[PDB]
């Protein structure tokens, strides 16, 4: 009757995420093909993106969920063309994302953020966007963050 | 630059008797008596307070002022030795050939003797004679452990060093051959 939580990284719309799982979920009594197809069904929203999946295991069945991360949300909001990960490598995420979508991602990530305010959450998402390498409103995310801190850009409260 | 006056202090426990004459220090406690000649260092000993030994140097250089700290630590370790004692635990570990350690006490000399056999299968018997005042026992609580106790910290540590030095692996890769007798713990008897 015990509950085990296993967190993993997976690519959406893929079956081979259970390749590493079957060494350890096998003693637990789970079916690797079943949990792989079930993970793919959960991550069918997030094609081509590395996402974090939580597995809740009780009485030898597993329930899957997708834990939202800032990097996955930003790369999904970038709206990149569909690509083959086997043939098209060394890609760069150099498109642009709007500041409204940045605030929406921050509202999504409020459940993880320890910041006091949505402005702090937005600045965290802007830093993650700067790491990813995209643009916000055609400018640098660092420049947008500096504008937010200096007061030119106003973030709505909650 | 010569410093006019420099002072150190050594507190003395209630059960310890310390006698200094001509820079020859004798410290007696519940566990026995230790003696050390400190005539190689110029120092004025005094009783600055009840239960405090004062050390002074007059018109000394920085090196002369610095030697008082060594004298302080030496006399303090003698006091600790006659009060609580010193105990070094050694562990002998082996891969294939079990190390056989035999401890005897020589009635003629009064010292302990440690005999080491079958070190990496060698047919020689290694013999180490302890310094006087050092007692050696084989521990029954743990496996393959010697215990060296005494009042003199220098004697106990040098005896442990002798046992560590005599079992040395030669002409082998020490990443592979891990055999030896090693000091595993240092502390007080009490």
């Amino acid at each position: 009757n015990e509950i085990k939580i296993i967190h993993l990284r997976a690519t959406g719309g893929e079956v081979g995420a259970s390749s590493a799982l079957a060494p350890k979920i096998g003693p637990l009594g789970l079916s690797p093909k079943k949990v792989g197809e079930d993970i793919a069904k959960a991550t069918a929203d997030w094609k081509g993106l590395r996402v974090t999946v939580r597995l809740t295991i009780q009485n030898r069945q597993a329930q899957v969920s997708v834990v939202p991360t800032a990097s996955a949300l930003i790369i999904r909001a970038l709206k990149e063309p569909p690509r083959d990960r086997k043939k098209e490598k060394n890609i760069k995420h150099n498109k642009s994302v709007s500041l409204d979508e940045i605030i929406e991602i921050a509202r999504t990530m409020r459940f993880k953020s320890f910041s006091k305010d949505l402005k702090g959450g937005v600045k965290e998402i802007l830093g993650t966007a700067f790491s990813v390498g995209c643009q916000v409103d055609g400018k640098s995310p660092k420049a947008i963050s500096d504008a937010i801190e200096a007061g030119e850009i106003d973030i709505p409260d909650e | 630059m010569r410093y006019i006056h420099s002072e150190e202090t050594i507190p003395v426990p209630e059960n310890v008797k310390v006698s200094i004459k001509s820079r020859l220090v004798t410290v007696e406690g519940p566990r026995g008596k230790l003696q050390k000649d400190l005539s190689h260092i110029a120092v004025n000993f005094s009783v600055v307070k009840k239960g405090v030994i004062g050390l002074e140097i007059h018109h000394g250089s920085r090196k002369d002022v610095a030697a008082l700290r060594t004298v302080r630590t030496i006399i303090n370790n003698m006091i600790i030795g006659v009060t609580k004692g010193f105990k070094y635990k050694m562990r002998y570990v082996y891969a294939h050939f079990p190390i056989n350690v035999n401890v005897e006490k020589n009635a003629e000399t009064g010292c302990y003797e440690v005999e080491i056999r079958n070190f990496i299968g060698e047919k020689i018997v290694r013999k180490v004679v302890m310094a006087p005042g050092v007692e050696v026992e084989i521990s029954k609580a743990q496996k393959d452990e010697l215990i060296l106790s005494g009042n003199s910290l220098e004697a106990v540590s040098q005896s442990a060093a002798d046992i560590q030095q005599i079992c040395k692996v030669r002409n082998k890769d020490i990443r592979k051959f891990l055999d030896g007798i090693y000091v595993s713990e240092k502390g007080n008897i009490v």
Binding site: - | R91, V93, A95, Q164, D173, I174, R175, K176, L178, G180, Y182, V183, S184
Partner: protein, 107 residues
């Protein structure tokens, strides 16, 4: 034995029980040892040692200056010449060496 057998031996059996303490103490004695080598070596070995120490001191100072300054081609060339190894490139009709040591016929 085969492949990384000493690493496997370290993983299965560890090392000698005093290895960490001996390594720490030797590293701690390195300062006294370096000064002793500077003051006690003789001859060509001492000279090579001193030149090597001079080189390491210079490189350390350069690295220190770079870490201090962490928080702060020349000639126009076309695109097909970019990222290549290009040379640095820096009346009286006099030669660069107008006078040399004269050579006698006996020499």
């Amino acid at each position: 034995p085969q492949n990384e057998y000493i690493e496997r031996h370290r993983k299965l059996h560890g090392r000698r029980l005093d290895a960490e303490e001996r390594a720490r103490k030797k590293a701690a004695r390195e300062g006294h040892k370096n000064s002793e080598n500077a003051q006690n070596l003789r001859g060509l070995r001492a000279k090579l040692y001193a030149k090597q120490r001079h080189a390491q001191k210079i490189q350390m100072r350069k690295a220190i200056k770079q870490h201090e300054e962490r928080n702060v081609p020349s000639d126009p060339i076309p695109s097909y010449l970019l990222d290549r190894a290009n040379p640095t490139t820096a009346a009286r009709f006099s030669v660069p060496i107008p006078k040399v040591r004269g050579i006698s016929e006996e020499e």
